[PDB]
Amino acid sequence: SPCVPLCNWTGWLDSGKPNFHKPGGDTELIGDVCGPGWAANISCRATMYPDVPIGQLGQTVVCDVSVGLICKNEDQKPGGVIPMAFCLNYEINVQCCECV
Ligand SMILES: [Ca+2]
């Protein structure tokens, strides 16, 4: 008697955030969490940019379809058009496959 995985979106979630200790460094890795070697859909956004892929706002982040999000701004950048610096809280939504 086997089970059958149900690939559902986790909902927008957030492992790591700038208000924790350092601004950039938002690494939300699903790949080694839900099942290393999966193939499912990811959506990467910022709370203030829910429509726009985070790189487009002038960011250097990599929200990768095989592993999850990787926000790491190493090069300093003061100022902005948002009252926040580079690499701000980002979040992902991934469609991982589970049964209960
Ligand atoms: Ca985050």
Side-chain angles (χ1 to χ4, degrees):
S1 338
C3 205
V4 183
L6 296 172
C7 255
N8 286 272
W9 297 79
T10 52
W12 282 108
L13 41 62
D14 190 30
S15 297
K17 53 204 94 295
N19 202 53
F20 187 71
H21 248 297
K22 295 179 184 178
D26 238 46
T27 320
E28 277 86 359
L29 254 20
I30 290 262
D32 58 304
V33 118
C34 288
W38 216 249
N41 293 280
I42 161 164
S43 284
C44 30
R45 294 295 185 271
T47 341
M48 249 303 292
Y49 304 85
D51 175 66
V52 199
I54 47 228
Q56 259 291 294
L57 329 9
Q59 291 310 328
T60 56
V61 175
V62 180
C63 50
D64 188 272
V65 302
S66 300
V67 292
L69 232 198
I70 298 110
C71 134
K72 310 197 196 312
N73 177 95
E74 189 171 44
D75 183 31
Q76 65 189 312
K77 233 150 256 62
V81 295
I82 179 87
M84 168 50 205
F86 46 72
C87 249
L88 62 135
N89 192 41
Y90 303 128
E91 282 116 295
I92 52 162
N93 204 335
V94 185
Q95 166 230 291
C96 296
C97 246
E98 281 213 302
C99 62
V100 296

